[PDB]
Symmetry: D2
Amino acid sequence: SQLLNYIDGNFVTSASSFANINPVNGKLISDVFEADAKQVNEAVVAAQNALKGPWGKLSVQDRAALIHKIADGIQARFEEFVAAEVADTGRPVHQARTLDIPRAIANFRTFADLAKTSHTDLFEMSTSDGSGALNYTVRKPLGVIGVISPWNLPLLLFTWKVAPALACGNTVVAKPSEESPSSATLLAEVMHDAGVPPGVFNLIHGFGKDSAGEFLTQHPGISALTFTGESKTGSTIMKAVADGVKEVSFELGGKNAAVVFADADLDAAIEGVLRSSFTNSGQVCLCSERVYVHRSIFDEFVSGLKVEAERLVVGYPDQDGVNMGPLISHGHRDKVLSYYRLAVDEGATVVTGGGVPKFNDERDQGAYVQPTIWTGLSDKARCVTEEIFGPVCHISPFDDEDEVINRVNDSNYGLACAIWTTNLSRAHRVSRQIHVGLVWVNTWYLRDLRTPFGGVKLSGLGREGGRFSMDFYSDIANICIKI
Amino acid sequence: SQLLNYIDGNFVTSASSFANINPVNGKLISDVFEADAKQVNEAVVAAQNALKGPWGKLSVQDRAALIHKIADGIQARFEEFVAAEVADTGRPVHQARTLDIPRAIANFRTFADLAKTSHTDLFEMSTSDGSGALNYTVRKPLGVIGVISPWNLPLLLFTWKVAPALACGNTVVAKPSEESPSSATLLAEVMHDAGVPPGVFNLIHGFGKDSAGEFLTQHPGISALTFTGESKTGSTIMKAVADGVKEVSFELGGKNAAVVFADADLDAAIEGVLRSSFTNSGQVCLCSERVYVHRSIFDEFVSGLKVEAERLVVGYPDQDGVNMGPLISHGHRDKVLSYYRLAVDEGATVVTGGGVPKFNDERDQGAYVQPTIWTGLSDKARCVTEEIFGPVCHISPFDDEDEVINRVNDSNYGLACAIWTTNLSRAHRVSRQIHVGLVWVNTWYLRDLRTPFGGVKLSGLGREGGRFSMDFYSDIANICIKI
Amino acid sequence: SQLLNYIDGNFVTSASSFANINPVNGKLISDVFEADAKQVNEAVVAAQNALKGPWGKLSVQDRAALIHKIADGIQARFEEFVAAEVADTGRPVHQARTLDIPRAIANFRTFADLAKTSHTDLFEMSTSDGSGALNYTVRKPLGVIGVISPWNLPLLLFTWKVAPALACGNTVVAKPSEESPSSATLLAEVMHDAGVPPGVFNLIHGFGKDSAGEFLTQHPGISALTFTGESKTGSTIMKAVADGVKEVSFELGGKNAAVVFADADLDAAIEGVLRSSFTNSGQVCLCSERVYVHRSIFDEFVSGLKVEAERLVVGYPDQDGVNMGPLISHGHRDKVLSYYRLAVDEGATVVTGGGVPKFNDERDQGAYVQPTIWTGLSDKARCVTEEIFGPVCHISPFDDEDEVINRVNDSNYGLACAIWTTNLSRAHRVSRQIHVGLVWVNTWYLRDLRTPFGGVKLSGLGREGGRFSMDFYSDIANICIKI
Amino acid sequence: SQLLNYIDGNFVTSASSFANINPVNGKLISDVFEADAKQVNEAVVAAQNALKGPWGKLSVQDRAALIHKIADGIQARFEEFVAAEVADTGRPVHQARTLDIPRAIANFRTFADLAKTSHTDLFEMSTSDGSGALNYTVRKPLGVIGVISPWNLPLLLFTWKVAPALACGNTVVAKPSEESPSSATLLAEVMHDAGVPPGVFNLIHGFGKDSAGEFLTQHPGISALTFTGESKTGSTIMKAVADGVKEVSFELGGKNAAVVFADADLDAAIEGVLRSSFTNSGQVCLCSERVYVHRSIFDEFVSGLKVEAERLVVGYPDQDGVNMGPLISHGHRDKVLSYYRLAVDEGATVVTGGGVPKFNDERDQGAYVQPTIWTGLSDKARCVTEEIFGPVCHISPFDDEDEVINRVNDSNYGLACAIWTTNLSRAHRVSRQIHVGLVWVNTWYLRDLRTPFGGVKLSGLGREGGRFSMDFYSDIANICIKI
Ligand SMILES: NC(=O)c1ccc[n+]([C@@H]2O[C@H](COP(=O)([O-])OP(=O)(O)OC[C@H]3O[C@@H](n4cnc5c(N)ncnc54)[C@H](O)[C@@H]3O)[C@@H](O)[C@H]2O)c1
Ligand SMILES: NC(=O)c1ccc[n+]([C@@H]2O[C@H](COP(=O)([O-])OP(=O)(O)OC[C@H]3O[C@@H](n4cnc5c(N)ncnc54)[C@H](O)[C@@H]3O)[C@@H](O)[C@H]2O)c1
Ligand SMILES: *C(=O)/C=C/C=C(\O)C(=O)O
Ligand SMILES: *C(=O)/C=C/C=C(\O)C(=O)O
Ligand code: NA
Ligand code: NA
Ligand code: NA
Ligand code: NA
């Protein structure tokens, strides 16, 4: 497979290519052409020009119809996108079929609909002469949106940004993770086939520092940079755009906690924490890598989770009953296993997992690790405070509600939290005190696309979703008429 | 000993003081104690702790009531605030009495009221199991808000940030401009007398780089930094908070245009542009330093404006009929005069002004300049493209509507624009094509505090005002209940 | 052709039928089975029951998709719907193709989208015990919506009610005008073929008093009655539902004015008033039957409008260049002609029209009248104060802006007004003073479906459109959780 | 003591008067002049005129400040208002001090605040010529609001309607209950002393039918009628305004249930149903006259409530620990006692009360009744299906969740419901299935004034509160500008 850039209506190669590797077996899947600085310029300039072309003349209704046409395009190639997403990342086929590709479709449809329904405000005011004035606001395209996305939910996160950007009339220069370039490239094909005017959507491949990613953030021609990824990368991009004072929107992961209270449905909570720790092999920014369980049910909770975790099938994306594929790459697995070691050095008890499974086939050339549970670490351990981004959790007992709220909040991060309790007052009382952008009670990662999505502290800045995306991806302009 | 810091409920001095100069005559008004890094730490920690004190326990109704009491406290000492604002800045006593102090009181009242009325959102969704779920959002205090304000509308802009910060339940560490520290110090005494709990509002004095401003900016304990001032300082601040990924809100001035079309009420447009160019001696981020006038009325407009500008009385804040005071400082005076010279060098015709008036009294030791009108420069002239922040405007003819719209938008800034026209279609057609955050038609700087206020490009990031401030100064949290 | 009721998923006849007459030539088009009280009761009960079936279990997104399927079904038979609407009413084919059927399809799509995007409110509050409470609101189906619609824009107005009813999860019993039953019956076929569950949508044919309309109105099983038609009829319906305290929504026509100021674009105003007076042969609740024109342009406006009126082609629905078809029925024509003589008796100058065209072919057996302009009546003339609902307008001069505002507002109706002026202040200053639900400036009947649509005084009560429909066709419930 | 009408800024007598009776002892408190038809017309005409006077030139800020001055004026005479409401109704001094008078003050403050903060909508749209159009909406005063209020919470309910009416710029003609005219007459003095312009607020005394109530209702000069009281009276008023098609808003009582599930905090539920049944001697539209208790806790619950009920002190309004005053009147006690008898006829077990207390003093000439509890009635009994409006409740056991939901909903009414449960899923799952306007979980009659308030079925029409009031008491006008 060859994966090219898509710049100003055309697919183009580059001076340099890099390998896309399948993490299931270590095999080469494709050569990917790295955009250089010149090509990034070309994309941004094309994006700037396209804003003054046909795209800029479309009614909101026409624009929304075309975006639905994009989403029809993905649906018409549904299985091709499933296969591309699975090949890049090793994620289970059922996950790609139920979470990944459908969400990418729903992202475009949801924001296409919002572009049609959304309106703005009218404020009337008195003036000293008695004639009054009126202020009204409009939303306009911000301009060229730079989009930089990660490899953990490639098409979902890539379209989570591209859909609202296009729905708001912007043009886009978008750079997918070098680890998972395939579905974004098929998306370029869908755009092209749907007749999206040239320059409106541009796809550039490559890495971050000293590559397409960095060149994007440094380009004076963009009006905003939306990014999901590692928190320190957020800081770097924020510095990079500072001289342009570009608008920024960041979701930057975290060190999320699950809390299980004594009145929880215990079997429900065990299954739910199994899902929150090990979904996508723990490679969701929302995963619970810290878990607090009331002392009175701690042992029974830990025993039950150990049993469920050792029932997880780890293997081929299409394997019967598969629950976990590999990590995204050998590089990421190096990081995760170095934390597996660190946990033991910090004095953890390894409840289950802690290494890599032996398959006695090509999966041994892949990037698999075992689902892993720890117990016995202090709230200050590095494995309990630093984002690992693997299929792991540490479990600790607690006694008191105010105490556990403090321990959950005692973090430089604050993206998400999951709480288990059957008690009505506790759900609402505790949830509002957790210092994060997203709380789930008796579930996890349940998404209504209209809700504000973002984190606090090192976990991000701004919110996206619903009207928060409609506001971020638009110039909000106030027009005051003296009457 | 004159102007003290206010930290954790105590007025405190510092190791070093600096002079506050009266720009009317260059005399010393007061010594101001410069907060050092330790004192800035102390203020941030105290604000962090106050979030856990009784301030954090107030209901929204009680918090609002207390904010109204701060406003009452300003009103109670109205004329003292006027005298402080006038002493620091030389602004006309009438301006301080009508624009500055009332706006500051209205800032607290409007955001107190919005604190009580504002509400959030309820989203219902279906789920696989048929029982559904609820997402609802809440606003919570962001935490400690760092406020850095400029010297041009001292109390107005300082309260513009402090009022919504308090209304949203935050605590505050605020650093007013070294040039105009008096009214913010009186506001501290007002907070004290009102019984605002210690730590909730903290005042630190000093400069930017290597002083209280830089320190505030780099402190890990703040949750956001809101700033009004020069764009390049905005960029410095954006880099400073980047490692903490702190929320940011910037309004950074610009090079604003006024446009007068042939069908304007000519007398009103001349009066309007006289106000937009010379109010506060041209020291408002919203002033029109570039003016475009349809060729059919260009000479008449220039003639009329010249006559009106030369009627302006430049003098004492309590001078009979006074229109303009001095610039804020000799240092700012030097910048402005550097531009007055550059304008001649760039080939400008000096319709009026272009130097400093000769008063033959103590005003000669202050920082006055003349209101100045230029003509004959090209759209690329430095004097036409760089923010001067003085009482000056260049006037250029135009012929076509699409032409003038392009020349207005050909700028790295985009804060505000004023359009003069009596034509219904043109007003709405042209206003929506101007790439700024704020357009006024047939008026200027007419303010409804509910409206989104901010700029595009180098002129800012984000919006404040109304629900935009309620959002920026709050954590927006989403809570999802599985049923 | 025979037109059946549709009740509980089955097309059914009745003991009695009535004739559907083509107003172009007076010929019989169809027999229509009249629903009796007994069949009305079956529809209401089937609708109640359908709330507890599969319909009531659809997620909002699934309900919206099925509603888009209804719209797809109409589109798939677009030309059949065009032919049906034309046959019943005589409207020009081009109007059916551009206004009527497209708006019916748009009505369903607009409200299906609003069903997906709309959300409700979250209010937090403090309590005595310091634990606080939460109030959240939800939208639920009101229950069974009774829909009674008029003959002037049959499918347009029929679906304007049925679309939001269904979108909000209600079930429906709908009674279209006896003059225009055909497209409603086609809509019933589309609903059936789309798989809309039995009892969700019920179509009952008949008249008002002592027939289907009245019986629907009197049935205790409905939860609301939405109605567009004659004002006195709205009053009757309001009395009929009073004992059940049913929710009601009425749009009741009016005696709308157009105002042409001295600075109007005269040719555009002539064309605009031509359209506002004579569209659909003046059979729109929104038509201008009163026109005020500034004295300085009155003679030229009257002359220009006479020319354009006499250029209108009055003829067959598919005749080349046709502008106007007949009135809906002989009965309506008797009413209109009655007013035409009354105008003469009241002292009117007949500028043009005032009678019936003579075709010397089968159209003479139809229900045609001529477009008619009057001049010289006083503001108290009956022909200036009572809604005629034919292709007529009276034109009167004025001198003063406040004067004409008073004359427009001096009416027992207040549905719409159209104003013509090129002046920015005038447009906003005048529009806000007109006591109507809807003002247009320099256009007429330009519809954005998100806007509140409705009248004041005798012209209606309640608003529909956008969120106004979502609120009216829903129970709004507040749920207060003590924490 | 005399109570006059207040019309066009003047207190005026009438050709007739009637007795205001203290229900504690049947002693005459004052004579009340009964406005006649001529006087009502004079009030409506004065309110109509005042719309064009100084009231109507008020900015929204200035109008709100005057409204707050009205509130201040009530606070300034707080104890007098307390005394007037007690005298009229016999309510405990304590309830008047904490519930009635402060809520009346909060009603004006909350709507004055809303008046300042509320804004409207801007919708942009494409047009066929490519220039587009703008639709913006505005709120204007509806006109003259007719207000008719009941005697159970005289000032609270009088001001609940009057406050938003005035906050929206309307003028008011208000008719308080014949049983409780005092606090409203004091309000008129406050309005007057506050400088409220003549004609803005008019107070007319009298009864319903054939008196000031009915006359208001039939007057063609009002624009709306807002009413809280008996459901049949709402049906009467709806017919009365129907010929003018006036806007109507009704809150019409009900037969509200409380539901106590087995996992309720039993003690809390016992206390909560005590309050919900006997507050204001059960004369609240919101009281729980039907209570369902899970079978497993039924006997315990009844036992507990009997004991708490017999603890209640029934006596003088100022009497030591008084919990209950008398009924409002003798006529009303007759109605209630008649239900006490019917309960027995219908076969009910009297757990407690069921008659009148015996004082051996002036109170024996009052209108006291005992707090009563019944058991053993069927769901169809008249005592369990008809509004008594006394301090009575019937308690019935239930077994299943879906069962009790069906029984709660099996009512021609639907105002409020209180649910008791500690379970998170149940509380949300059950609350949304109750067919009422208002649900409380684990509390009762907890009021956030921003929330929508109203009932379904016979219990009302429309919603009031927050923006629902701002919309009902305003004309919503849409203004569409073609560009
Ligand atoms: N947007 C406005 O309203 C506004 C206001 C004042 C000045 N200006 C512009 O800025 C120019 C210079 O004036 P100025 O020097 O007072 O503006 P400045 O932006 O440098 O300083 C304004 C505020 O920022 C603080 N500050 C400065 N440097 C900082 C730093 N490195 N870190 C943290 N805080 C810092 C200052 O102490 C002051 O409170 C003017 O000529 C004008 O062009 C704009
Ligand atoms: N607002 C509008 O758009 C509109 C539309 C049509 C007619 N009108 C006015 O009404 C006049 C007469 O026309 P029309 O008789 O067809 O209008 P109408 O108001 O009497 O009837 C319209 C609809 O209401 C039904 N209806 C009539 N009486 C009823 C009753 N007592 N109970 C229940 N339903 C009833 C009809 O069957 C039809 O479906 C026209 O001349 C015109 O002035 C207004
Ligand atoms: C009345 O004759 C016209 C009604 C039109 C509407 O209701 C509409 O939505 O356009
Ligand atoms: C009915 O008896 C009580 C009504 C209460 C209100 O309307 C309220 O605002 O609290
Ligand atoms: Na890969
Ligand atoms: Na100074
Ligand atoms: Na017909
Ligand atoms: Na009484």
